[PDB]
Amino acid sequence: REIVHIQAGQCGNQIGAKFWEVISDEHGIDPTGSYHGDSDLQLERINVYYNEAAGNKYVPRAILVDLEPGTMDSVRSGPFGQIFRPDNFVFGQSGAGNNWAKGHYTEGAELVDSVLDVVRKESESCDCLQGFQLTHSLGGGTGSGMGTLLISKIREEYPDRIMNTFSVVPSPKVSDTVVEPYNATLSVHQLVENTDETYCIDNEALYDICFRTLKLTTPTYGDLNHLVSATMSGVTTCLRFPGQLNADLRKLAVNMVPFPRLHFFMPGFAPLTSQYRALTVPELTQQMFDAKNMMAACDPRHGRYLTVAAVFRGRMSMKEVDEQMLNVQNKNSSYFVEWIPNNVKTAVCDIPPRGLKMSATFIGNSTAIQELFKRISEQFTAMFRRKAFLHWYTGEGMDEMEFTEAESNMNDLVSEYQQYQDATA
Amino acid sequence: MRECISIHVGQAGVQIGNACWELYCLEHGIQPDGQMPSDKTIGGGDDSFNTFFSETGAGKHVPRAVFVDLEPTVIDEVRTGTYRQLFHPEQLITGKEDAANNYARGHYTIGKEIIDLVLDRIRKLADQCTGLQGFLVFHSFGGGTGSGFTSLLMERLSVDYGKKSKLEFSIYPAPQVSTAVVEPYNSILTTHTTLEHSDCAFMVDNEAIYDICRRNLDIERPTYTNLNRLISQIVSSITASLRFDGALNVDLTEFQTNLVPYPRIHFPLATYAPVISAEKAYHEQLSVAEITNACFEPANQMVKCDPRHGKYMACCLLYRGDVVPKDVNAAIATIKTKRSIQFVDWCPTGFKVGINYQPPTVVPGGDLAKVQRAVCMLSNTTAIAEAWARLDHKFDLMYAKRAFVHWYVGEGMEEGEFSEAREDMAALEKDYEEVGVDSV
Ligand SMILES: Nc1nc2c(ncn2[C@@H]2O[C@H](COP(=O)(O)OP(=O)(O)OP(=O)(O)O)[C@@H](O)[C@H]2O)c(=O)[nH]1
Ligand SMILES: Nc1nc2c(ncn2[C@@H]2O[C@H](COP(=O)(O)OP(=O)(O)O)[C@@H](O)[C@H]2O)c(=O)[nH]1
Ligand SMILES: COc1cccc(-c2cc(NCc3ccc4[nH]ccc4c3)nc(N)n2)c1
Ligand SMILES: [Ca+2]
Ligand SMILES: [Ca+2]
Ligand SMILES: [Ca+2]
Ligand SMILES: [Mg+2]
Ligand SMILES: [Mg+2]
């Protein structure tokens, strides 16, 4: 059960690099690819994300994609730059200019075949491919436009494999350009059809967390990516380390996705870091269900949970987590749908993340994620009703009905979340 | 890679190019002979400065520029001036008789004889590029060459280089230095003809530059050298994103995405600060907040107009020097709570920011003081239409009597081109009005 990782664009490759830095440290792999760890539990599932190369060297099963070489050159020079397989760097020269059309139709189409070639070589070397994960942003052009193009191409060649994504949603408080709502709306319509799980990482929340909670006056993209890498590590701990949980991507999707289109999750993490005081199990459970620890700028009390999964890391009383986990149920029992019995899952991993005795990762399938899509839809319509900045896209061959269609599909997605939010037994 | 070719057309374009490339050489440590000791990659490279300079095996750094004028006296000063060695002779192109402030002569009569040579010389520069980005065209509205030949060139570049991007730096006529009654005619004719061929045009009002030199530099009667050296600073701030790199550097193209909502609405208003004499600058270092506030005082704009009585479609701040985001965000917060900054209802009100750490440089013996930090604001405001209105009014006064029109008809133009161009300006003025109305 191997996973193939893909990171596309500026945002996708930076959060992807941090990810490989974090889990590489947890598995005991050094920047050169040599193992110098203390426990054999680190290696029992190293194959899930790493290939074993000549010389007992471990190489991430990762593909790096971008339409301009800038960020990828930085990655090759970064701390863990030399660990990636050099032939897995696939880049163009021009770029996408924060244009979904360039990444999806013109500039990205020129490069997509070359990317799929590397996918095949990685998949052919898989004993039993389990699925794919993609890291990318939805506000730019390469990760947004070409990223969804890659997903459509992968579902063509591997139609029976799981396709999941860690997608960074744009926010005006952290914005590079104004056409970000356009690109996001066009990308989400693709994710509704061609992904099994999409973790909605909202830059609005990451900023509010760095500023309000962590008290960071001037947050940088590096500060936000520290939160993202920690969460992705927590989400993947159920596959990367050997508990008595037989977790496969498809089995996890079956347990979390009651309806095919409603597969957009709210990530969460606790404690929030950037101290030494030991955190208590009651504190971990109370923080991980708090809105201030959510990676999507949505209020869970404004919607209802379809399914929930809590992952605890460290050595703690498995009895005490159950008591506190069962306790929190009552404090928000109204916010859990009663027509999916026992819809809250709990997993425990004995291995803690770096420099934390105990941590908790939160994955929620809540109808309150609808708030995020409304926000993007509003920003979209504010411009589209005046056809502002459309020339950037029509110049690349797109028609205006493609914008209208994408708009309607997201409003449909919003309405679908609303019917189940009001549904009762 | 991602090279830019600069084209300097006419007296204004050439002399402004002189000041700009002089400033570029100082900022990058390039000597008048083209040598740059700090570049260890001889004869080539992919450095940021290589977007504006090519390299020879002998170590010379040659501007990716073409100078063109229909008479030779101005480019002759380049051929014998301090930076003669910088340019290969083929980059300096001259005719023998000028356009006599007649758009027709620059576009048709005289421009026709030299256009092919210019395009061939431009092609020789493009063939040296691995990933050419676009063109920077420097010219005046009022001159016969700056207006007529530029229009012809822009038309021909759209044919030879499809939609490859083309940016303008245009000199808007001001009576304090404009010595030609027909400059309104040429201005409308060229603005009409290039509108479909320009992706982004930065207009510089000589009156605005004139007042800034008089007010802030205490120059009783500025010269073209005073004006151009100031213009170079604005040009440098706009192009610094392409010539330098860093972690806070935002490419000009990324700014351009925010500044052009509609293809026709591609005229950003530029504001620059600080412009301060060395006598004042002494014992008075300006902060990030102070220079940012200056960006909203209309007395510092490149074009005379009132943003307070218009609406914003975009606001970009390009800092260079000793600037960090914390101070920028603080200054923007204070400005938002104190000043008249209204956006159209159909675009976000955020400010796009970029920072270059390389500090500003000044030409030896100039009037500008060397400062530790500076800023250029690029804003898409409807108020810029005031410049079209003033110019269109002067056009109407003379054209109602057909004054001076015979000079254009004598060179082969038809009255219809005048009315066709004026009507396009009327639509442009109406377009700006439309974009500012609130939605329904
Ligand atoms: N800012 C600035 N404007 C200039 C400069 N030189 C000329 N101009 C402007 O150019 C106009 C006069 O026309 P010219 O520039 O001489 O015309 P040309 O482009 O050289 O072509 P001709 O019509 O043949 O002379 C006036 O409106 C001036 O304001 C200059 O050095 N700096
Ligand atoms: N968290 C995070 N978000 C980023 C980063 N860089 C860009 N983004 C987001 O992505 C959007 C810009 O898209 P971009 O990264 O340029 O897309 P690309 O052109 O495919 O690389 C912005 O709205 C940001 O919110 C980063 O380093 N970290
Ligand atoms: C994006 O790629 C990945 C990669 C690795 C993991 C995941 C992931 C983790 C997860 N959390 C743990 C969990 C949740 C519910 C459970 N039920 C029974 C065991 C069990 C365990 N839940 C989901 N859906 N995916 C997704
Ligand atoms: Ca191509
Ligand atoms: Ca192929
Ligand atoms: Ca070099
Ligand atoms: Mg970017
Ligand atoms: Mg002349």
Tab-separated table of N, CA, C and O in Angstrom, chain B residues 365-428:
chain	number	residue	atom	x	y	z
B	365	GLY	N	26.071	64.450	-8.530
B	365	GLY	CA	25.802	65.832	-8.863
B	365	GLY	C	24.350	66.174	-9.102
B	365	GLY	O	24.060	67.300	-9.522
B	366	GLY	N	23.427	65.249	-8.851
B	366	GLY	CA	22.021	65.534	-9.023
B	366	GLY	C	21.459	66.346	-7.874
B	366	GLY	O	22.159	66.744	-6.943
B	367	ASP	N	20.151	66.590	-7.948
B	367	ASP	CA	19.453	67.360	-6.928
B	367	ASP	C	18.742	66.494	-5.899
B	367	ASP	O	18.385	67.001	-4.829
B	368	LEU	N	18.541	65.209	-6.183
B	368	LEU	CA	17.884	64.320	-5.238
B	368	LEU	C	18.859	63.878	-4.160
B	368	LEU	O	20.022	63.568	-4.437
B	369	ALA	N	18.377	63.856	-2.925
B	369	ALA	CA	19.168	63.335	-1.828
B	369	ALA	C	19.107	61.817	-1.838
B	369	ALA	O	18.109	61.219	-2.250
B	370	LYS	N	20.184	61.192	-1.378
B	370	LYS	CA	20.177	59.747	-1.228
B	370	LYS	C	19.405	59.405	0.036
B	370	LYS	O	19.662	59.968	1.105
B	371	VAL	N	18.450	58.491	-0.094
B	371	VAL	CA	17.556	58.134	0.994
B	371	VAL	C	17.686	56.641	1.249
B	371	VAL	O	18.130	55.873	0.392
B	372	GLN	N	17.294	56.233	2.455
B	372	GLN	CA	17.394	54.829	2.822
B	372	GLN	C	16.202	54.011	2.342
B	372	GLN	O	16.333	52.794	2.167
B	373	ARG	N	15.052	54.644	2.124
B	373	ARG	CA	13.870	53.936	1.658
B	373	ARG	C	13.027	54.871	0.805
B	373	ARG	O	13.030	56.089	1.001
B	374	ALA	N	12.317	54.284	-0.156
B	374	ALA	CA	11.463	55.032	-1.066
B	374	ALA	C	10.305	54.137	-1.486
B	374	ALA	O	10.329	52.921	-1.283
B	375	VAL	N	9.281	54.752	-2.074
B	375	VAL	CA	8.067	54.032	-2.446
B	375	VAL	C	7.481	54.660	-3.702
B	375	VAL	O	7.530	55.879	-3.888
B	376	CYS	N	6.924	53.811	-4.565
B	376	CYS	CA	6.139	54.242	-5.714
B	376	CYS	C	4.791	53.541	-5.657
B	376	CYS	O	4.734	52.308	-5.609
B	377	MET	N	3.713	54.320	-5.652
B	377	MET	CA	2.361	53.780	-5.622
B	377	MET	C	1.790	53.756	-7.034
B	377	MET	O	1.889	54.745	-7.766
B	378	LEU	N	1.227	52.614	-7.419
B	378	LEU	CA	0.509	52.454	-8.679
B	378	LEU	C	-0.961	52.217	-8.353
B	378	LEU	O	-1.298	51.237	-7.679
B	379	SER	N	-1.827	53.111	-8.823
B	379	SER	CA	-3.245	53.063	-8.502
B	379	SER	C	-4.081	53.213	-9.763
B	379	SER	O	-3.790	54.053	-10.619
B	380	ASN	N	-5.105	52.369	-9.881
B	380	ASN	CA	-6.096	52.473	-10.950
B	380	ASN	C	-7.269	53.280	-10.407
B	380	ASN	O	-8.168	52.749	-9.753
B	381	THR	N	-7.246	54.585	-10.662
B	381	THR	CA	-8.292	55.496	-10.221
B	381	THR	C	-8.983	56.104	-11.433
B	381	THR	O	-8.339	56.393	-12.447
B	382	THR	N	-10.299	56.291	-11.325
B	382	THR	CA	-11.040	56.935	-12.401
B	382	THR	C	-10.600	58.378	-12.607
B	382	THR	O	-10.809	58.931	-13.692
B	383	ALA	N	-9.982	58.991	-11.595
B	383	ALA	CA	-9.567	60.385	-11.700
B	383	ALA	C	-8.601	60.616	-12.853
B	383	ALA	O	-8.490	61.750	-13.333
B	384	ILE	N	-7.899	59.574	-13.309
B	384	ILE	CA	-6.965	59.733	-14.417
B	384	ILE	C	-7.668	60.237	-15.669
B	384	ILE	O	-7.022	60.819	-16.547
B	385	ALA	N	-8.985	60.036	-15.774
B	385	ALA	CA	-9.718	60.521	-16.937
B	385	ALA	C	-9.679	62.039	-17.052
B	385	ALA	O	-9.864	62.571	-18.152
B	386	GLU	N	-9.452	62.747	-15.942
B	386	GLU	CA	-9.301	64.197	-16.006
B	386	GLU	C	-8.237	64.598	-17.020
B	386	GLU	O	-8.376	65.614	-17.711
B	387	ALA	N	-7.167	63.806	-17.128
B	387	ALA	CA	-6.118	64.116	-18.093
B	387	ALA	C	-6.632	63.985	-19.520
B	387	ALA	O	-6.297	64.805	-20.383
B	388	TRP	N	-7.433	62.952	-19.794
B	388	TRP	CA	-8.054	62.838	-21.109
B	388	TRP	C	-8.978	64.022	-21.375
B	388	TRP	O	-9.018	64.553	-22.491
B	389	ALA	N	-9.738	64.443	-20.359
B	389	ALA	CA	-10.700	65.525	-20.544
B	389	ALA	C	-10.012	66.836	-20.907
B	389	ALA	O	-10.397	67.500	-21.876
B	390	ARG	N	-9.001	67.241	-20.132
B	390	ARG	CA	-8.278	68.464	-20.467
B	390	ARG	C	-7.751	68.405	-21.893
B	390	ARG	O	-7.892	69.359	-22.665
B	391	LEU	N	-7.136	67.282	-22.256
B	391	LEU	CA	-6.553	67.157	-23.586
B	391	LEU	C	-7.632	67.170	-24.663
B	391	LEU	O	-7.471	67.825	-25.700
B	392	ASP	N	-8.743	66.462	-24.437
B	392	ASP	CA	-9.812	66.438	-25.431
B	392	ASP	C	-10.429	67.818	-25.622
B	392	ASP	O	-10.842	68.164	-26.735
B	393	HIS	N	-10.505	68.618	-24.557
B	393	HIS	CA	-11.063	69.960	-24.682
B	393	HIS	C	-10.209	70.823	-25.602
B	393	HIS	O	-10.727	71.504	-26.493
B	394	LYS	N	-8.891	70.806	-25.398
B	394	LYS	CA	-8.001	71.563	-26.270
B	394	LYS	C	-8.109	71.078	-27.710
B	394	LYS	O	-8.074	71.882	-28.650
B	395	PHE	N	-8.252	69.766	-27.903
B	395	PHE	CA	-8.461	69.226	-29.242
B	395	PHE	C	-9.705	69.827	-29.889
B	395	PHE	O	-9.676	70.238	-31.055
B	396	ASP	N	-10.813	69.879	-29.144
B	396	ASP	CA	-12.070	70.358	-29.711
B	396	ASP	C	-11.987	71.827	-30.103
B	396	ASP	O	-12.582	72.246	-31.103
B	397	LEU	N	-11.255	72.629	-29.328
B	397	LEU	CA	-11.189	74.058	-29.613
B	397	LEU	C	-10.554	74.317	-30.973
B	397	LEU	O	-11.047	75.143	-31.750
B	398	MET	N	-9.469	73.607	-31.285
B	398	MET	CA	-8.775	73.833	-32.547
B	398	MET	C	-9.467	73.123	-33.706
B	398	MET	O	-9.518	73.655	-34.820
B	399	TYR	N	-10.005	71.924	-33.470
B	399	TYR	CA	-10.566	71.158	-34.577
B	399	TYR	C	-11.883	71.748	-35.067
B	399	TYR	O	-12.251	71.550	-36.231
B	400	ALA	N	-12.611	72.460	-34.203
B	400	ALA	CA	-13.843	73.104	-34.647
B	400	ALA	C	-13.575	74.097	-35.769
B	400	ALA	O	-14.430	74.298	-36.640
B	401	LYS	N	-12.398	74.720	-35.770
B	401	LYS	CA	-11.986	75.632	-36.826
B	401	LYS	C	-11.036	74.977	-37.818
B	401	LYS	O	-10.560	75.650	-38.737
B	402	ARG	N	-10.750	73.685	-37.654
B	402	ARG	CA	-9.801	72.972	-38.505
B	402	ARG	C	-8.427	73.636	-38.485
B	402	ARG	O	-7.657	73.529	-39.443
B	403	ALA	N	-8.109	74.316	-37.384
B	403	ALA	CA	-6.826	74.995	-37.264
B	403	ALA	C	-5.684	73.990	-37.340
B	403	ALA	O	-5.688	72.970	-36.646
B	404	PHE	N	-4.706	74.281	-38.197
B	404	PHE	CA	-3.501	73.485	-38.406
B	404	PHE	C	-3.786	72.142	-39.066
B	404	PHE	O	-2.841	71.392	-39.339
B	405	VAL	N	-5.051	71.811	-39.341
B	405	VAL	CA	-5.372	70.501	-39.901
B	405	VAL	C	-4.738	70.323	-41.274
B	405	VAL	O	-4.443	69.195	-41.689
B	406	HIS	N	-4.520	71.421	-42.003
B	406	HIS	CA	-3.980	71.309	-43.355
B	406	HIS	C	-2.584	70.701	-43.357
B	406	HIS	O	-2.188	70.062	-44.339
B	407	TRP	N	-1.823	70.884	-42.275
B	407	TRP	CA	-0.499	70.275	-42.200
B	407	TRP	C	-0.595	68.755	-42.204
B	407	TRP	O	0.271	68.070	-42.763
B	408	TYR	N	-1.638	68.206	-41.577
B	408	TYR	CA	-1.811	66.759	-41.552
B	408	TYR	C	-2.388	66.249	-42.866
B	408	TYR	O	-1.937	65.224	-43.390
B	409	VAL	N	-3.387	66.948	-43.409
B	409	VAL	CA	-3.975	66.540	-44.681
B	409	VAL	C	-2.930	66.579	-45.788
B	409	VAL	O	-2.934	65.739	-46.696
B	410	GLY	N	-2.016	67.550	-45.731
B	410	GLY	CA	-0.976	67.651	-46.739
B	410	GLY	C	-0.032	66.468	-46.769
B	410	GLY	O	0.592	66.211	-47.804
B	411	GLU	N	0.087	65.741	-45.662
B	411	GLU	CA	0.941	64.564	-45.592
B	411	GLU	C	0.183	63.272	-45.874
B	411	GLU	O	0.756	62.188	-45.725
B	412	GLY	N	-1.087	63.362	-46.276
B	412	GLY	CA	-1.853	62.207	-46.701
B	412	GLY	C	-2.948	61.755	-45.757
B	412	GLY	O	-3.625	60.767	-46.064
B	413	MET	N	-3.157	62.432	-44.631
B	413	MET	CA	-4.204	62.012	-43.712
B	413	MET	C	-5.556	62.596	-44.116
B	413	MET	O	-5.648	63.604	-44.822
B	414	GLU	N	-6.616	61.944	-43.642
B	414	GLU	CA	-7.988	62.340	-43.912
B	414	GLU	C	-8.630	62.877	-42.639
B	414	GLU	O	-8.290	62.459	-41.528
B	415	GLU	N	-9.556	63.821	-42.813
B	415	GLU	CA	-10.294	64.346	-41.670
B	415	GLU	C	-10.943	63.228	-40.863
B	415	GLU	O	-11.115	63.358	-39.646
B	416	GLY	N	-11.314	62.127	-41.522
B	416	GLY	CA	-11.976	61.041	-40.821
B	416	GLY	C	-11.139	60.444	-39.708
B	416	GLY	O	-11.678	60.018	-38.683
B	417	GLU	N	-9.816	60.403	-39.888
B	417	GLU	CA	-8.953	59.877	-38.836
B	417	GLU	C	-9.030	60.744	-37.586
B	417	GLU	O	-8.997	60.232	-36.461
B	418	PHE	N	-9.139	62.061	-37.766
B	418	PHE	CA	-9.313	62.959	-36.630
B	418	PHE	C	-10.593	62.632	-35.870
B	418	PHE	O	-10.568	62.389	-34.659
B	419	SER	N	-11.729	62.620	-36.574
B	419	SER	CA	-13.003	62.370	-35.906
B	419	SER	C	-13.062	60.953	-35.352
B	419	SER	O	-13.620	60.727	-34.271
B	420	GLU	N	-12.496	59.987	-36.079
B	420	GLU	CA	-12.434	58.620	-35.575
B	420	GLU	C	-11.669	58.562	-34.259
B	420	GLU	O	-12.113	57.925	-33.296
B	421	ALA	N	-10.518	59.237	-34.195
B	421	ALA	CA	-9.723	59.222	-32.971
B	421	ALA	C	-10.432	59.953	-31.839
B	421	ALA	O	-10.445	59.475	-30.698
B	422	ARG	N	-11.031	61.110	-32.131
B	422	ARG	CA	-11.729	61.858	-31.090
B	422	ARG	C	-12.878	61.045	-30.509
B	422	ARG	O	-13.104	61.056	-29.293
B	423	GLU	N	-13.613	60.327	-31.362
B	423	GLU	CA	-14.728	59.521	-30.878
B	423	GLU	C	-14.243	58.407	-29.958
B	423	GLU	O	-14.892	58.094	-28.953
B	424	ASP	N	-13.101	57.799	-30.283
B	424	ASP	CA	-12.538	56.784	-29.400
B	424	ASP	C	-12.236	57.367	-28.025
B	424	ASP	O	-12.466	56.714	-27.001
B	425	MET	N	-11.720	58.599	-27.982
B	425	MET	CA	-11.467	59.249	-26.700
B	425	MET	C	-12.769	59.525	-25.960
B	425	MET	O	-12.821	59.433	-24.728
B	426	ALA	N	-13.828	59.876	-26.692
B	426	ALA	CA	-15.121	60.090	-26.054
B	426	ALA	C	-15.626	58.804	-25.414
B	426	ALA	O	-16.144	58.819	-24.291
B	427	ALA	N	-15.469	57.677	-26.109
B	427	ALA	CA	-15.829	56.392	-25.523
B	427	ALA	C	-14.953	56.080	-24.317
B	427	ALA	O	-15.447	55.603	-23.287
B	428	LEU	N	-13.647	56.337	-24.428
B	428	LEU	CA	-12.744	56.083	-23.310
B	428	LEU	C	-13.161	56.886	-22.084
B	428	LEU	O	-13.197	56.360	-20.966
